[model samples]
Target: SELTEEQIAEFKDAFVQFDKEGTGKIATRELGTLMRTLGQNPTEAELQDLIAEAENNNNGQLNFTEFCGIMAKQMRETDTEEEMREAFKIFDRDGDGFISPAELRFVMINLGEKVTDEEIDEMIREADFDGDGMINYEEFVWMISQK
Candidate 1:
């Protein structure tokens, strides 16, 4: 189903605010807080696991790159209807029935504020099904449902 313009705008605005607060960066705690604000709080163990993942380089702190990776991984791990809908609303740039790689890239560039191409590819691979290298609403919904 197509998202209304107002819904798209609201989603974009929320992402923009998140990017602003994160300074184009994100950490586990920050991610947890955002989820909590959205009424989806993570458990202490889940939070710790996320933190560990975020500190990929073992630097004891989550840099922007690690944070992005961690967030993506965590999002996949904790995929829910709400999260899938939110992602779909943001990624469906033309309000189209399917999500192309270009649309996904656009959403990441705008919302992620300096995301790498590799990261975008990883995200797509993680979400994409049917081996078509694209995400349709049904596949997208099913992918999230698995989590």
Candidate 2:
């Protein structure tokens, strides 16, 4: 199963509290401040290096999703689920949360594989459990877990 609502709210509160600037995303300095305040004794330089490790998505800061994502990854010594989600996100070029057949073809074609519409339809038929034409997290997770 995906994350529970309670867990989501809990982490939301946690990351927001860490997001001191009310920017809804925590910048590297803010993350360093949060760690320092939270009894972590890491050097400021250390914190900078670490927070930079999570930087991306063009937001210039660690949003709730990225913060939780890193935490979730740490908890994963088996988080194929999260890794699978990352893969899905990479292929979800339009940021639509679901992977369209075109996005699938885009990635595949880059890998030097040819993709016909029939192949795309077949792949979707195999992966899109709800017949939704696009793949949602649950569907992609299931497809990946099978691997």
Candidate 3:
């Protein structure tokens, strides 16, 4: 299952509290305080890690979508096959049931991440264990397990 509507709404409330201008974006550094407000204790390194995970350097702001993505990832203990499939479907953009190089590239671009082709290949190599050159639901669920 995907993130519930109420979860999104709650996230928005917290986000708006920090986003005083209602710009739907917040400073990367402010993320620490925001996470704390949401009851998450992200240490200095973990804050850095979250920013790195987004592949966005300083001066990079996070929009609502990006914030939600980061929150969802941090709350990963309950990750199930259904949730993994939902994530897989997101990368599989066209609902092709597989994440191809092109689809992965597309997803990364839209997510606003500065991903190099090398990184993309590395990600595929990590998950595409069947040597099928793409990631299917099975591979996706298995990849999530590695978390």
Candidate 4:
């Protein structure tokens, strides 16, 4: 999905804060500070690359639209740990620390497809590192990160 209104507003606030002269444009050299202000920790090389990508022919500067485009790219880079935690939450019911057989069954049956116990068995076996017949948070993350 694209950036939301609040996200755009946040970007605008950061850009305007850095545009000390009240000019609509900011120097490419200040890209690193702007990105840092927006909570992105970019390296010197990354800052140079970003400047090269967004500066174009605007006399080595970027406008609001270009700044948003850069932030959009950063936002699109998914945080796998966050996503994995959400997915794990779905599979691990009862606020328990592991994915039990009944929990998996509950999720599978509600999937609106004909899922067999055999399929579940194989699935669990793929990620069951301790051979305890359950999927712990670490195991679930390992399974997802394997892909």
Candidate 5:
């Protein structure tokens, strides 16, 4: 649904034009080149991770399809819309739409972050607006998107 035939075709042509050496994919030859292409510099480690996640060859090359997938994945993660919904569901524990202090404690502990009862209450205090004693979706999303 994301990439149309025409768009994908265009993407392939663009990448190929830049890939004149017959690599059959986006070339990741230089760290400086990626900074220009991505509009921001990524650490070499980050770039390496990106290459692997795109399923690019270990040699650091990516076909148009994999490139598009990797780009879309990166875009989807930064902001907290999908990001918030993801962790919210995981910590919600009970199918209840809100995260209670108890559920919050469970989440922190489960993630191996180690939370004391007082810390859990403190977190809830910051997150739970309306004094409702819980972090509802609206409150949760607001808090997350702010960061």
Candidate 6:
């Protein structure tokens, strides 16, 4: 979904929080917690893998800058808006040119959210439409229009 101005502001706040040490980045632990909060909880194995991928200089640790780089890479891989749109297109199976709550639920399930139907419906109501229950194609398009 296209991040709202508020959401973008919130993310910038989090980034600033992560850079509290004035290093312009976040440490490994901070990155882990951030990912979890974003609903992408990594298992121990996954964490280790990320550490391995992100660690520089074979120092056995990831500093803030390294963490940021790794995060940018991951976002490019998985959450880039173009990729999201392709995935969304596949989920909107009927080619009705819109994605309903059911379609969104199917997509979220694959993303490991385990979202309840009620939760999906609620999300659609709250953010997927103009304070309405249904999300039309334009709404769906707008949702994924991120920077």
Which predicted model would earn the best TM-score? 3
Candidate ranking (TM-score, best to worst)? 3, 4, 5, 2, 1, 6
For candidate 2, write residues 30-113 as lDDT tens digits. Answer: 666654454235566656666767564434677666555544433343445766776677667778688887787887665445
Displacement of the residue 52 alpha carbon in candidate 5, Å: 25
Better of 1 and 3 by lDDT: 3
- Model 3: pairs clashing at backbone N, Cα or C within 3 Å: none
Segments of candidate 3 deviating more than 4 angstroms = 1-3, 25-30, 48-62, 144-147
| Residues forming the 10-long window of minimal summed lDDT in candidate 1 | 1-10
The predicted structure with the larger TM-score, 1 or 2, is 2
lDDT of each: 0.58, 0.63, 0.73, 0.72, 0.62, 0.58
Residue 116 of model 2 has an lDDT of 90
For model 1, residues 49-115, the per-residue Cα lDDT tens digits are 7777666644443444454443454446554566677666666887767777677668666654466
lDDT order of candidates, top first: 3, 4, 2, 5, 1, 6
Q: State residue 76's C-alpha deviation in candidate 3, in Å.
A: 3.9
User: Highest lDDT among the candidates is held by which one?
Assistant: 3
Q: Count the backbone clashes (under 3 Å) in each candidate.
A: 0, 0, 0, 0, 0, 2
Lowest lDDT sum, 10 consecutive residues, model 5, at 30-39
Q: Answer with 1 or 4, whichever has the higher lDDT.
A: 4
Candidate 2, residue 20: Cα displacement in angstroms equals: 49
Candidate 6 per-residue C-alpha lDDT over 9-118 given as tens digits, one digit per residue, 9 for 90 to 100: 55456666656667555666566777766534556787777765656543444454454444434454344455555545665856766667777778766544578889
State in Å the error of residue 60, model 1: 22
**Across residues 1-147, which tens digit of lDDT does each residue of candidate 3 receive?**
136677677777888887766667887778888888885676789888877755555356778877887776666767567677767777687765777777777877876656777788888888876798888888778765554
Against the hidden reference, what TM-scores do the models get?
A: 0.41, 0.42, 0.69, 0.48, 0.45, 0.40
